Nucleic acid binder design. Structure first.
Ligand SMILES: [Mg+2]
Ligand SMILES: [Mg+2]
Ligand SMILES: [Mg+2]
Ligand SMILES: [Mg+2]
Ligand SMILES: [Mg+2]
Ligand SMILES: [Mg+2]
Ligand SMILES: [Mg+2]
Ligand SMILES: [Mg+2]
Ligand SMILES: [Mg+2]
Ligand SMILES: [Mg+2]
Ligand SMILES: [Mg+2]
Ligand SMILES: [Mg+2]
Ligand SMILES: [Mg+2]
Ligand SMILES: [Mg+2]
Ligand SMILES: [Mg+2]
Ligand SMILES: [Mg+2]
Ligand SMILES: [Mg+2]
Ligand SMILES: [Mg+2]
Ligand SMILES: [Mg+2]
Ligand SMILES: [Mg+2]
Ligand SMILES: [Mg+2]
Ligand SMILES: [Mg+2]
Ligand SMILES: [Mg+2]
Ligand SMILES: [Mg+2]
Ligand SMILES: [Mg+2]
Ligand SMILES: [Mg+2]
Ligand SMILES: [Mg+2]
Ligand SMILES: [Mg+2]
Ligand SMILES: [Mg+2]
Ligand SMILES: [Mg+2]
Ligand SMILES: [Mg+2]
Ligand SMILES: [Mg+2]
Ligand SMILES: [Mg+2]
Ligand SMILES: [Mg+2]
Ligand SMILES: [Mg+2]
Ligand SMILES: [Mg+2]
Ligand SMILES: [Mg+2]
Ligand SMILES: [Mg+2]
Ligand SMILES: [Mg+2]
Ligand SMILES: [Mg+2]
Ligand SMILES: [Mg+2]
Ligand SMILES: [Mg+2]
Ligand SMILES: [Mg+2]
Ligand SMILES: [Mg+2]
Ligand SMILES: [Mg+2]
Ligand SMILES: [Mg+2]
Ligand SMILES: [Mg+2]
Ligand SMILES: [Mg+2]
Ligand SMILES: [Mg+2]
Ligand SMILES: [Mg+2]
Ligand SMILES: [Mg+2]
Ligand SMILES: [Mg+2]
Ligand SMILES: [Mg+2]
Ligand SMILES: [Mg+2]
Ligand SMILES: [Mg+2]
Ligand SMILES: [Mg+2]
Ligand SMILES: [Mg+2]
Ligand SMILES: [Mg+2]
Ligand SMILES: [Mg+2]
Ligand SMILES: [Mg+2]
Ligand SMILES: [Mg+2]
Ligand SMILES: [Mg+2]
Ligand SMILES: [Mg+2]
Ligand SMILES: [Mg+2]
Ligand SMILES: [Mg+2]
Ligand SMILES: [Mg+2]
Ligand SMILES: [Mg+2]
Ligand SMILES: [Mg+2]
Ligand SMILES: [Mg+2]
Ligand SMILES: [Mg+2]
Ligand SMILES: [Mg+2]
Ligand SMILES: [Mg+2]
Lengths: 273, 44, 92
RNA sequence: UACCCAUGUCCAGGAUGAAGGUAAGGUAAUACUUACUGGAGGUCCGAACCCACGCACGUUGAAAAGUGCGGGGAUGAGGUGU
RNA sequence: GUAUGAGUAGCGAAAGAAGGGUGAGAAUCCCUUCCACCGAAUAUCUAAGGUUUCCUGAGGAAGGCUCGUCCGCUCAGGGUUAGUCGGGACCUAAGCCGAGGCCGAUAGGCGUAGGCGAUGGACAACAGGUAGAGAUUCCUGUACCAGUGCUAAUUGUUUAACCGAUGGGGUGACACAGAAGGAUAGGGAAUCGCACGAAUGGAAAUGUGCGUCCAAGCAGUGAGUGUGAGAAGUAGGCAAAUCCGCUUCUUGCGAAGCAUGAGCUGUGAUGGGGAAGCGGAAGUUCCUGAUUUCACGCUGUCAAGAAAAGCCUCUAGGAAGAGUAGUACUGCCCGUACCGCAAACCGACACAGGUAGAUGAGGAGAGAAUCCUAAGGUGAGCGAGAGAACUCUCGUUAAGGAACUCGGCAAAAUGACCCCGUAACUUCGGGAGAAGGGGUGCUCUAUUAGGGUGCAAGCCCGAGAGAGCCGCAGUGAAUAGGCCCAGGCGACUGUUUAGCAAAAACACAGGUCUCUGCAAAACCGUAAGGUGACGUAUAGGGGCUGACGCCUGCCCGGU
């Protein structure tokens, strides 16, 4: 659920958070952990190329299975855990082999269920199938774009895509953004919606809470100097004294479309958002 | 008042040392010019 | 390595003479000789039975004689103690 | 010196009493009330530590930016070493 | 190079006095006594840094803001000892280098295998002595770790004792906050020992002063903390596995058994140390009690908390020698002196500044606050004598009490603990220590009523009351909120012009517009290569507004 906090202080006044009712265990699977090091937006050369990053709580990588290519082995859900590296939760699945791996937790996935992948899998929440074996109208997630590569298209918490038709070698999908797209029929997908739907209702409440997650402050361009930003300067507060609002590097920023005009995938996009 | 020079042996030899000079084309240029002028200590 | 070239010369002073009756002998050795080369060199030269060796390294002092500042030589001093059943060394 | 990365370390004492829990009530069951428990916070007072708000002195200075007396933060968007 | 200012300013926070000594020469050097200062430091260690400043014998030209017989200064000789401490021959993080390789007018940039790189991981020694300078290093006593040879039995020999991976697996291996415990260090009383037993009214004892112990290792024990047990069977763990993981059965548990575990007892101790007069007496009982250890052990929370080696195990493999016991021997390189809140480091100075970490006692106290002291350390490198104006830092002022002034600037005032009581407004948490008041000393009832500890002796903690007593005054010193009414701006905590501006400025949580379907947009770079992201529209970049409440109207001609 969503947990409101009592207004004891001025920083806890508007703050809300999840209660983590779905999470089952608090210890990760040791043999599936890899180290991460923060980069703070620093380049290959050490330059700050993407700004407003750096300096949060330290985390550790949990290696996830997006390919889902273990076919014919019944996999049993063991726990549902917390992942700092993504908005959705994850589920630990240990197969009849003895092997264990993490997957994205779908909506309604509970401990004790059995999960299948392949061609003979049933259409149930958690199973992985090729897009040609999925009937029209089902809600899927974790769509992959090239066969054998791994899930990539719908993966954040509460997101879902819907199968929409067939065109021989391709399948129509209505992506979460509202886009209709053509994807090969030999690419896989998982049935269901993605786990943690309430994630968008959280009110951060504090500036320090943004700092905990790795976000440095954002300075507006109107309070800079003329050599710093196309908006800086002027005596007092100044309007946007230009034809259009501008990014820190020129290149208008409001309404100006930035997709390449000679793209090679314009023939696979049926209708844009 | 914390002053500007805070000494350290390692921080000195890693930046101004002989091997640091010899690891670069321009550091070798510096060593060559100091040999030309005739200085007693190169790099250091 | 030619034992007579890694043992240089005895160290004669009040500090050395005070321990000289403890069967401890102080020598000057090369700056490269190790604790065990010294032991075998002594056993080769003086025909004794060495029990321990201790070594220490000395820097060079800074002297002058007016406008001419320089450094004295670099030293490596070894104290050699012989076993109870072994003949002594003279120094005298 | 500014920001960042890896790895360590520091913060005398005292005050307040969030969620939750238990018991007794109250209900068809709940809500709700009262005691006990519990120990949250960019919480409170205040040393070390960090800072620099007022005044005085200094102004060929003890000091090329300090001292004295008061002052702000002091579990955190904290101070600091390599 | 030499004048004038001119024998002028200054001589850099601080308490000294006298008596002896040395000497050509003494406020300044040495010794003695008294006095004074620091004492969560001005004390004890130890990193960085310095690089001989350390010790001894001589010296007085220059340096020392004066003097000097002295010195961190001059001269000459000396002084630093490690299998176990810190670092290499062990391991890895950020980062750096990088065979082939990709990219590029040259130069070169990037990067794979591989390797360097502690601020982190692993790893065997303790207690005393040392009168010029070193001590876990030398010496004494007792140990441990790895290895080697020599003896004596034992066992095994290719259906094969035994070893065992550069491979697999487990451990190593981890955040933050809170509370209750065990123990020990430390501290305090009695007891015990030795000495004194007294100057001025009194005291031969209810007198006074000092002390009132001891490791590592070895053998036992142990508060505790975690903890399922057995047996079958294997689509997985690049090959194999008796090991791990997964499944099914039997058996059931705060009871044992396994891991760890502070500490305690004996030995080490026929040893060492120890108050007084070279020797050496006593070393018991009780109370209090950690910021240390058990121990990130437990509980809770969300922001979800390094890697590799090492150690154990499994096979793949190697195998005719192997361990066992006793003995003797072997163990490399670098640092080790001295300063180290400082006159030896960074500041041109013997500079009122800056400098990481460990320890850091007593009375009163909640306290590392505050005042006075212990151990220990200091008396600050110009003096003496007068007691003018003026300047600085302080202390009191009759009557008035902001009349001063741009402005109550500065100063004065409140200040601890316990009890009573407390408004508008409110986002129901606050406002609030609102405001405004009252009580504190000492004696007796009194080793109280009652608690903690103990088997008891005893020791510690200490509310209410009554009666009294004394002062102008009882938190009698130091330390310790002034408060209220109304308005503007910013919601709040936070940040800012090192060295004139700390704010109404920036940030912020929240709102909205817009771009982006993943080799994403955006950004760095000539490119390769990267960040974004080991992410995927509930995500990422940009513009504006800035908690919260009520709202956000009209115009698309111009750009
Ligand atoms: Mg941004
Ligand atoms: Mg902003
Ligand atoms: Mg500006
Ligand atoms: Mg411009
Ligand atoms: Mg403008
Ligand atoms: Mg402006
Ligand atoms: Mg204007
Ligand atoms: Mg040595
Ligand atoms: Mg960091
Ligand atoms: Mg606070
Ligand atoms: Mg405050
Ligand atoms: Mg500042
Ligand atoms: Mg203060
Ligand atoms: Mg405070
Ligand atoms: Mg004059
Ligand atoms: Mg004068
Ligand atoms: Mg002085
Ligand atoms: Mg005198
Ligand atoms: Mg004092
Ligand atoms: Mg103090
Ligand atoms: Mg050094
Ligand atoms: Mg120097
Ligand atoms: Mg010298
Ligand atoms: Mg000296
Ligand atoms: Mg003189
Ligand atoms: Mg003089
Ligand atoms: Mg000298
Ligand atoms: Mg030894
Ligand atoms: Mg060593
Ligand atoms: Mg070591
Ligand atoms: Mg090459
Ligand atoms: Mg490179
Ligand atoms: Mg590597
Ligand atoms: Mg290394
Ligand atoms: Mg280290
Ligand atoms: Mg060790
Ligand atoms: Mg010494
Ligand atoms: Mg010693
Ligand atoms: Mg881990
Ligand atoms: Mg008398
Ligand atoms: Mg013992
Ligand atoms: Mg825990
Ligand atoms: Mg010292
Ligand atoms: Mg100096
Ligand atoms: Mg001085
Ligand atoms: Mg100083
Ligand atoms: Mg006390
Ligand atoms: Mg104290
Ligand atoms: Mg004393
Ligand atoms: Mg004096
Ligand atoms: Mg008056
Ligand atoms: Mg009066
Ligand atoms: Mg009045
Ligand atoms: Mg008035
Ligand atoms: Mg007037
Ligand atoms: Mg006026
Ligand atoms: Mg004032
Ligand atoms: Mg009683
Ligand atoms: Mg008082
Ligand atoms: Mg006070
Ligand atoms: Mg503000
Ligand atoms: Mg300024
Ligand atoms: Mg790219
Ligand atoms: Mg590219
Ligand atoms: Mg990338
Ligand atoms: Mg939505
Ligand atoms: Mg608003
Ligand atoms: Mg604004
Ligand atoms: Mg609002
Ligand atoms: Mg409008
Ligand atoms: Mg128009
Ligand atoms: Mg138009």
């Amino acid at each position: 659920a969503i947990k409101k906090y009592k207004p004891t202080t001025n920083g806890r006044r508007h703050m809300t958070s999840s209660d983590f009712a779905e999470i089952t265990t608090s210890t990760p699977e040791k043999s599936l952990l890899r180290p991460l090091k923060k980069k703070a937006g620093r380049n290959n050369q050490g330059k700050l190329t993407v700004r407003h990053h750096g300096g949060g709580h330290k985390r550790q990588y949990r290696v996830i299975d997006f390919k889902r290519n273990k076919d014919g082995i019944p996999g049993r859900v063991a726990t549902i855990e917390y992942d700092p590296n993504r908005s959705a939760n994850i589920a630990l699945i240990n197969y009849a082999d003895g092997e264990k791996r993490y997957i994205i937790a779908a909506k309604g996935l509970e401990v004790g269920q059995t999960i299948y992948s392949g061609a003979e899998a049933d259409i149930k929440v958690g199973n992985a199938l090729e897009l040609k074996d999925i009937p029209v109208g089902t809600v899927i997630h974790n769509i992959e774009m090239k066969p054998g590569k791994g899930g990539q298209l719908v993966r954040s918490a509460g997101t879902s895509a819907q199968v929409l038709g067939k065109e021989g070698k391709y399948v129509l999908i209505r992506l979460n953004s509202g886009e209709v797209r053509m994807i090969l029929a030999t690419c896989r997908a998982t049935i269901g919606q993605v786990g943690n739907e309430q994630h968008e209702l959280i009110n951060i409440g504090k500036a320090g809470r943004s700092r905990w997650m790795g976000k440095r402050p954002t300075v507006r361009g109107s309070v800079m100097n003329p050599n710093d930003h196309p908006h800086g300067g002027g005596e007092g507060k100044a309007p946007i004294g230009r034809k259009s609002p501008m990014s820190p590097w020129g290149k208008p920023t409001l309404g100006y479309k930035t997709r390449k005009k000679n793209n090679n995938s314009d023939k696979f996009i049926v209708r844009r958002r | 008042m914390k002053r500007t020079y805070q000494p350290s042996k390692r921080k000195r030899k890693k930046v101004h040392g002989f091997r640091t000079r010899m690891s670069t084309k321009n550091g070798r240029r510096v060593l060559a010019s100091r040999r030309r002028k005739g200085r007693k200590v190169l790099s250091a | 390595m030619d034992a007579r070239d890694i043992i240089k010369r005895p160290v004669v002073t009040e500090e050395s003479t005070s321990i000289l009756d403890d069967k401890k002998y102080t020598f000057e050795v090369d700056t490269r000789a190790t604790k065990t080369q010294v032991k075998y060199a002594i056993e080769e030269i003086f025909d004794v039975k060495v029990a321990k060796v201790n070594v220490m390294n000395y820097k060079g002092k800074l002297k002058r004689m007016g406008r001419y500042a320089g450094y004295t030589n670099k030293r490596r001093k070894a104290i050699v103690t012989v076993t109870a059943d072994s003949k002594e060394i003279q120094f005298f």
